[PDB]
Design an enzyme around this catalytic site. Structure first.
Site, short mmCIF file in Angstrom:
data_model
loop_
_atom_site.label_atom_id
_atom_site.label_comp_id
_atom_site.label_asym_id
_atom_site.label_seq_id
_atom_site.Cartn_x
_atom_site.Cartn_y
_atom_site.Cartn_z
N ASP A 1 -0.22 -3.92 -21.86
CA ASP A 1 -1.61 -3.88 -21.44
C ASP A 1 -2.47 -3.07 -22.42
OD1 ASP A 1 -1.57 -5.57 -19.25
OD2 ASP A 1 -1.89 -4.00 -17.75
N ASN B 1 -2.57 -10.35 -21.85
CA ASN B 1 -2.42 -10.44 -20.41
C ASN B 1 -2.98 -9.18 -19.75
OD1 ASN B 1 -1.46 -11.56 -17.90
ND2 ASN B 1 0.23 -10.08 -17.98
N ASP C 1 -1.01 -1.28 -5.35
CA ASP C 1 0.12 -1.40 -6.26
C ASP C 1 1.30 -0.56 -5.81
OD1 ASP C 1 -1.74 -1.80 -9.41
OD2 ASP C 1 -1.51 -3.09 -7.65
N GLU D 1 -0.72 -10.31 -10.79
CA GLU D 1 0.26 -10.89 -11.73
C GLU D 1 0.96 -12.13 -11.18
OE1 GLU D 1 0.85 -9.76 -15.27
OE2 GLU D 1 -1.16 -9.62 -14.37
N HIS E 1 5.51 -7.28 -13.75
CA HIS E 1 6.16 -5.99 -14.01
C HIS E 1 6.54 -5.22 -12.74
CE1 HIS E 1 1.99 -3.81 -14.00
NE2 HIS E 1 1.89 -4.99 -13.42
N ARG E 2 5.69 -5.27 -11.72
CA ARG E 2 6.00 -4.52 -10.51
C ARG E 2 7.11 -5.12 -9.65
NH1 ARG E 2 2.90 -0.56 -11.24
NH2 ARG E 2 0.80 -0.82 -12.12
N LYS F 1 4.61 -4.60 -19.40
CA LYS F 1 3.17 -4.67 -19.18
C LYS F 1 2.61 -3.25 -19.03
CE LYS F 1 -0.39 -6.35 -16.02
NZ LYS F 1 -1.24 -7.03 -17.03
C1 LIG Z 1 -3.26 -5.82 -10.80
C2 LIG Z 1 -3.02 -4.63 -11.89
O1 LIG Z 1 -3.53 -3.26 -11.74
C3 LIG Z 1 -4.84 -3.16 -11.24
C4 LIG Z 1 -5.63 -2.11 -12.15
C5 LIG Z 1 -6.95 -1.59 -11.60
C6 LIG Z 1 -7.85 -0.85 -12.53
O2 LIG Z 1 -9.06 -0.95 -12.37
O3 LIG Z 1 -7.30 -0.18 -13.38
C7 LIG Z 1 -7.32 -1.79 -10.21
C8 LIG Z 1 -6.37 -2.54 -9.27
O4 LIG Z 1 -6.93 -4.00 -9.04
P1 LIG Z 1 -7.81 -4.49 -7.70
O5 LIG Z 1 -6.85 -4.18 -6.50
O6 LIG Z 1 -9.09 -3.65 -7.72
O7 LIG Z 1 -8.03 -5.98 -8.09
C9 LIG Z 1 -4.84 -2.57 -9.79
O8 LIG Z 1 -4.15 -3.35 -8.80
C10 LIG Z 1 -3.60 -4.84 -13.35
O9 LIG Z 1 -4.25 -4.31 -14.30
O10 LIG Z 1 -3.15 -6.02 -13.39
P2 LIG Z 1 -1.20 -4.36 -12.08
O11 LIG Z 1 -0.77 -4.06 -10.62
O12 LIG Z 1 -0.57 -5.71 -12.51
O13 LIG Z 1 -0.84 -3.22 -12.99
#
Ligand SMILES: C[C@](O[C@@H]1CC(C(=O)O)=C[C@@H](OP(=O)(O)O)[C@H]1O)(C(=O)O)P(=O)(O)O
Length: 427
Positions: A49, A94, A313, A341, A385-386, A411
């Site tokens: 990332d 990604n 997450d 993801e 990744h999770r 990631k």
């Molecule tokens: C989904 C993910 O991580 C996201 C990163 C993020 C941020 O602003 O840093 C906010 C969240 O998304 P939302 O719930 O507001 O949509 C996390 O879930 C990311 O960057 O993809 P990850 O869970 O795959 O790390």
């Protein structure tokens, strides 16, 4: 298909120096790029990332240097909006935390650039952000499926009254918040209704203030931003360790500890996922808070029924930890698990059932009834990744577990399995 098989882990105990926060890292990189001056980020996360963000900055003409372990980065601030003409393609790999923020930031001025990335990036929604940006004056065109990348940005975001739907992702608001201060006109960001993943908005605001910008937050329903501002280098900036990455290790201790201490985050952390520790505590584990650490010591594990919208997450980690808890665990209000993801509600339910759990996949919740004993399963990871990290915890039992595509952890956490092994004790 590559795979990694984890043999049962008898006990976990140790200390983990957390990799840098991905959320903080990419926000810091973008602000550092837009700011005046040289920013030195330390404890920067080295993962796909972040690498993709760095690659995009390079493509955008931003100069920076990385330390050997790529955790220290010196960025030469652009001193204002990045300029990109010629309708060139900006490949974001990604990194959604690159795609969303850059989609907004590159709407400043008179750019002409196309944002895209790996095929899977085109599957993550961005319609709400585009809608908001356009209300702010941005000219945006969907090159493929409406409401999704790739996008052709042709500038024009000047500010003004902007509505934004915050019901599917906090990231759209985050992207608007970081870009607006630089718009020529003041911006009034109005949240249409519900705002999910609210804690991430606080991270955004925290980073923005660090870079010299503050806005008026009116109970998270509306945000007043004065335009014509400039981000300023804070000099050296220490990236907090990743609280989301930390959940796996703290959960491991709650399940099979021992005591696991994670360093890089503490009681003062800005990340909402440190609240994951409170959940483990509610489940029966013991938590210790330090200035630069959080530790978890095995107690017992009891099922819980909670709204997990504040830690979407880290909540996935609770879903597999639930396999080891007494009773049925219910995680509610996690609909956006579906648009990340992979559809994490579908994926989590599918893989949890494979190791023996009875699972109800609700539309926006999941109920997990653990089996008396887990059974072996070759876990599908959905390029997520999770999924790989959550299911690694299945090994904290009498059964080994095979994780497909273990490298997908890269990631946000390339060294995940070695770190887990670090705290894995045979005795
Ligand atoms: C989904 C993910 O991580 C996201 C990163 C993020 C941020 O602003 O840093 C906010 C969240 O998304 P939302 O719930 O507001 O949509 C996390 O879930 C990311 O960057 O993809 P990850 O869970 O795959 O790390």
């Amino acid at each position: 298909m590559e795979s990694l098989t984890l043999q049962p882990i008898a006990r976990v105990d140790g200390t983990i120096n957390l990799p840098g926060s991905k959320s903080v890292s990419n926000r810091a990189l973008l602000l550092a790029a837009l700011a005046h001056g040289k920013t030195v980020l330390t404890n920067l996360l080295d993962s796909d990332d972040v690498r993709h963000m760095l690659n995009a900055l390079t493509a955008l003409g931003v100069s920076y240097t990385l330390s050997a372990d790529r955790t220290r980065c010196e960025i030469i601030g652009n001193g204002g909006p990045l300029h990109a003409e010629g309708a060139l393609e900006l490949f974001l790999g990604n990194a959604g935390t690159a795609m969303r923020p850059l989609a907004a930031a590159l709407c400043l001025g008179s750019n002409d650039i196309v944002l895209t990335g790996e095929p899977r990036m085109k599957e993550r929604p961005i319609g709400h952000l585009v809608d908001a940006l356009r209300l702010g004056g941005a000219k945006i065109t969907y090159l493929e499926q409406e409401n999704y990348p790739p996008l052709r940005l042709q500038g024009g975001f000047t500010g003004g009254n902007v509505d934004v739907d915050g019901s599917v992702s906090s990231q759209f608001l985050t992207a608007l918040l970081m870009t607006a201060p630089l718009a020529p006109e003041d911006t009034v960001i109005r949240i249409k209704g519900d705002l999910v993943s609210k804690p991430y908005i606080d991270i955004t605001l925290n980073l923005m203030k660090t870079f010299g910008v503050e806005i008026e937050n009116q109970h998270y329903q509306q945000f007043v931003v004065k335009g014509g501002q400039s981000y300023q280098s804070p000099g050296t900036y220490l990236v907090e360790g990743d609280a989301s990455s930390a959940s796996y290790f703290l959960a491991a201790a709650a399940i099979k500890g021992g005591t696991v201490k994670v360093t890089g985050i503490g009681r003062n952390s800005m990340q909402g996922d440190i609240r994951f520790a409170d959940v483990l505590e509610k489940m029966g584990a013991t938590i210790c808070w330090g200035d630069d650490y959080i530790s978890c010591t095995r107690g017992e594990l009891n099922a819980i029924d909670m709204d997990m919208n504040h830690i979407p997450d880290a909540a996935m980690t609770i879903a597999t930890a639930a396999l080891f808890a007494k009773g049925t665990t219910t995680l509610r209000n996690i609909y956006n698990w579906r648009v990340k993801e992979t559809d994490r509600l579908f994926a989590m339910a599918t893989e949890l059932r494979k190791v023996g759990a009875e699972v109800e996949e609700g539309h926006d919740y999941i109920r997990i009834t653990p089996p008396e004993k887990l059974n072996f399963a070759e876990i599908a990871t959905y390029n997520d990744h999770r999924m790989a990290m959550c299911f690694s915890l299945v090994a904290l039992s009498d059964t080994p577990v095979t994780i497909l595509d273990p490298k997908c952890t890269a990631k946000t956490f390339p060294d995940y399995f070695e770190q887990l092994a670090r705290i894995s004790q045979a005795a």
